[PDB]
C-alpha cells in the first residue's frame, strides 16, 4: 500500500483540498506517462507529474499504471463510488471485495498494509474463500488500498492493489 | 523448540484409507499455516496442500482433493490427513510444514511418516497369475503353449480349480474358453486345450488360427478377491448385455457406467464388474445381485465405487466416484455364471480421465544439475528454472533419512544456522543456489521451491557429493 515496492508506483495523492482524485507516479522524472486500461491517457513531459482523474464525486474507476525511462509500473485498481480487477459489491452499508486471483489457496487479505480478515473477533469482518465482505462501512476508515494474495506469496508480488473510496 | 510430528503412517492395501496426524508443538498452532508434503521413493517433494488452523481454509492439490482430507484440531494442535483410497503410487514419507508467511517458506518440517501402499490386499487375494510368455507371437497351425503359474495353490474348499483362460479378441469383450481348469465352454472350439495343477497351469493352442489371436487373460478364481493375470496377447510370428456410452471426465469427478441386461432374468445371476485398465490387466470390482443390492466391492476401489441396480428396467448402474488419472480403463459389464465365471460380458464403456496437469499452468520448477560430484571446498552451483516467473524462491536442504530444512528464503535469505557459504541469486524464473566451498558435511539433496501460486513447486532436488 504505502510502499512501491513491487512495481506498484501508481499511488494516490490523498492531499487534495478539493475532492479531486490526484495519481502519484513513483519513477525517476524524466518523462511521465500516464496509462488507463493499457491506453495511455497522457504525457508528462517533466514539470507537473501527478495525473488529474476529476471530482472523487464522478467516481474514476480503472487501471491507471505509470511509466518513466523505464518499464511501465504495475496497475492500481481504482474503485471510487460516493488482467481481471479485483471485484467491488456495494449492497446497502455492505462492501464485498473479491481476489482477482483464486487458485483455490488460503487467500490473505491486507488494508493500509494491514491484515484483515483473519481473526473471526469482528462481526463487521467476514472473510469466505477468495470474497472479503466489510459491513457497516466507514467511508473514512477503511478505504484506502487493499490487496489480495494466498498464504505463502508477497503482498508485493500481487499483480495489483485495490484502492476502494466509498461512501455508504 | 518448534516440533511438528508425523504419524498414522503405515503399511495398507490399495483402496484402504489412512489417516495421518500431525501434532505441532513449540508455537501457536492456529497463527501458522500446516502443510503437508509427499516424498514419494526416488520422487521430489511433492506439496499435497495446505490447512490453516485459526480459520480452517483447506487448499489441496488437484490429485488427491477428491481422495484426501485435510483437518486440523486446535485443541491438540495436531493437523490430520484423511487419506481415502489409497493406491500404490501414494506410497512415500509424508511429511508435515509449519508455512510462515512473513518469510514466504515452510520453516519448520516434520520428521515424516513413510506410508507403503502394498499388503497383496490381505496376500492370497492378490494371487499373482504370472503368464509364462508374454505377447508370445506365433504363426498359424502350430501347438502354442501358453503357461501361467499361481502365487497361491488355485485349489478352493469345494477342491474345483475355479481356474479359466479367457480369450480377448481385438476389439471385442474378452469371452472365456476353458470353463474348468481343462474343459472347454460351448462354441469354444477343442482347437484350444489346457492342463495344469497346483500352482503351475498352462493353455495350450494345437491348431492357431486368425481366431486364436487376441490376448489370453487367466482368471484365478479361488482367491476370494478374483485376479487376472498380467497377459500374454498371442500374435503372428439370446443374452446379451448392453453397456452404456463412452464418457470422459475430469480428475474426482464421478462416472455411472450402465450396463442394460435382456435375455435373462435380471435377478437371477451376479453382474460382477471388471475394469481394464490401459497397459494393465483386468481387475475385477465388485459385484451385486440384482435382486438384492447386495454389494461385494473389492479392494483396489473399496472407498471409491458404488454399484446400484434397477431391477425395474433390467439395468445396472455402478457409479465410481472420485475419478483419479490412474483409473481410467473400459469397465467392461460382465455376468458371471454358474460353474464358470465372467460368462457373457458386455460392450463395456470407456471412460477416460485426467485434467490439463498444469503443464504451463502450474508453475515447473526445473533443477540442474540434478546430481553433481565435487571436491571438499570446490564452489557448487545448483540452477532452478521456473516455467513462470516466480517473485522469490525457497531453497531446502534434505539429508538422506531426514526431513528437508530451508536453507534460503526470499531468495537470498540463509535461515538460522546456515553457513555464510550458501548463498541463492535470481529472480523471476531464473534462480541459483551457490556453495562457494563445499564442506564433507554438506552432501545432501537441495532442492528449489516456488510459493507465488498453489500448489507449491519443487525442484527435483540436486544430489550433492563429495568425490
Known amino acids: 500500500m504505502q510502499s512501491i515496492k513491487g512495481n506498484h508506483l501508481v499511488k494516490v495523492y490523498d492531499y487534495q483540498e478539493d475532492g479531486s482524485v490526484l495519481l502519484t507516479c513513483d519513477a525517476e522524472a524524466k518523462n511521465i506517462t500516464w496509462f488507463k486500461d493499457g491506453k495511455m491517457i497522457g504525457f508528462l513531459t517533466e514539470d507537473k507529474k501527478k495525473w488529474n482523474l476529476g471530482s472523487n464525486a464522478k467516481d474514476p474507476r480503472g487501471m491507471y499504471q505509470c511509466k518513466g525511462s523505464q518499464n511501465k509500473s504495475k496497475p492500481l485498481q481504482v474503485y471510487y463510488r460516493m488482467q481481471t480487477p479485483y471485484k467491488v459489491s456495494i449492497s446497502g452499508t455492505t462492501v464485498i471485495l473479491t481476489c482477482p486471483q483464486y487458485p483455490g489457496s488460503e487467500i490473505l487479505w491486507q488494508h493500509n498494509d494491514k491484515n484483515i480478515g483473519g481473526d473471526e473477533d469482528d462481526k463487521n469482518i467476514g472473510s469466505d474463500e477468495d470474497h472479503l465482505s466489510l459491513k457497516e462501512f466507514s467511508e473514512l476508515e477503511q478505504s484506502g488500498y487493499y490487496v489480495c494474495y494466498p498464504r505463502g506469496s508477497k503482498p508485493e508480488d500481487a499483480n495489483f492493489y485495490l484502492y476502494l473510496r466509498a461512501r455508504v | 523448540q518448534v516440533q511438528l510430528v508425523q504419524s498414522g503412517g503405515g503399511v495398507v492395501q490399495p483402496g484402504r484409507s489412512l489417516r495421518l496426524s500431525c501434532k505441532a508443538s513449540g508455537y501457536t498452532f492456529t497463527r501458522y499455516t500446516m502443510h503437508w508434503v509427499r516424498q514419494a521413493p526416488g520422487k521430489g517433494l511433492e506439496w499435497i496442500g495446505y490447512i490453516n488452523p485459526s480459520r480452517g481454509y483447506t487448499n489441496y492439490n488437484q490429485k488427491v482433493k477428491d481422495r484426501f482430507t485435510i483437518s486440523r484440531d486446535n485443541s491438540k494442535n495436531t493437523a490430520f490427513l484423511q487419506m481415502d483410497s489409497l493406491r500404490p503410487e501414494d506410497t512415500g514419507v509424508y511429511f508435515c510444514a509449519r508455512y510462515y508467511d512473513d518469510h514466504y517458506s515452510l520453516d519448520y518440517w516434520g520428521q515424516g511418516t513413510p506410508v507403503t501402499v502394498s499388503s497383496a490386499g490381505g496376500g492370497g487375494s492378490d494371487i499373482v497369475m504370472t503368464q509364462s510368455p508374454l505377447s508370445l507371437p506365433v504363426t498359424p497351425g502350430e501347438p502354442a503353449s501358453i503357461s501361467c503359474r499361481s502365487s497361491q495353490n488355485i485349489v478352493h474348499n469345494n477342491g474345483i480349480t475355479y481356474l479359466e483362460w479367457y480369450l480377448q479378441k481385438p476389439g471385442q469383450s474378452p469371452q472365456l474358453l476353458i470353463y474348468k481348469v481343462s474343459d472347454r465352454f460351448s462354441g469354444v472350439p477343442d482347437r484350444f486345450s489346457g492342463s495344469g495343477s497346483g500352482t503351475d497351469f498352462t493353455l495350450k493352442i494345437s491348431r492357431v488360427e486368425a481366431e486364436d489371436v487376441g490376448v489370453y487373460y487367466c482368471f484365478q478364481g479361488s482367491h476370494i478377491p478374483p485376479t487376472f493375470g498380467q497377459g500374454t496377447k498371442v500374435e503372428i510370428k439370446q443374452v446379451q448385455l448392453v453397456q452404456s456410452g463412452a464418457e470422459v471426465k475430469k480428475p474426482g469427478a464421478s462416472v455411472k457406467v450402465s450396463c442394460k441386461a435382456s435375455g435373462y432374468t435380471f435377478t437371477s445371476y451376479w453382474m460382477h464388474w471388471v475394469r481394464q485398465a490401459p497397459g494393465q490387466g483386468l481387475e475385477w470390482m465388485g459385484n451385486i445381485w440384482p435382486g438384492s443390492g447386495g454389494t461385494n466391492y473389492a479392494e483396489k476401489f473399496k472407498n471409491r465405487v458404488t454399484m446400484t441396480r434397477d431391477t425395474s428396467i433390467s439395468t445396472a448402474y455402478m457409479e465410481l466416484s472420485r475419478l483419479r488419472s490412474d483409473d481410467t480403463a473400459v469397465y467392461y459389464c460382465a455376468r458371471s455364471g454358474g460353474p464358470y465365471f465372467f460368462d457373457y460380458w458386455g460392450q463395456g464403456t470407456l471412460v477416460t480421465v485426467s485434467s490439463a496437469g498444469g503443464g504451463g499452468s502450474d508453475i515447473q520448477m526445473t533443477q540442474s544439475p540434478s546430481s553433481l560430484s565435487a571436491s571438499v571446498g570446490d564452489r557448487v552451483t545448483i540452477t532452478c528454472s521456473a516455467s513462470s516467473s516466480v517473485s522469490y524462491m525457497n531453497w531446502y536442504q534434505q539429508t538422506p533419512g531426514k526431513a528437508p530444512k530451508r536453507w534460503i528464503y526470499?531468495?537470498?535469505k540463509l535461515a538460522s544456522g546456515v553457513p555464510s557459504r550458501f548463498s541463492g541469486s535470481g529472480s523471476g524464473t531464473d534462480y541459483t543456489f551457490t556453495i562457494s566451498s563445499l564442506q564433507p558435511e554438506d552432501i545432501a539433496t537441495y532442492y528449489c521451491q516456488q510459493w507465488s501460486s498453489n500448489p507449491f513447486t519443487f525442484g527435483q532436488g540436486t544430489k550433492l557429493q563429495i568425490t
Open positions: 526470499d531468495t537470498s
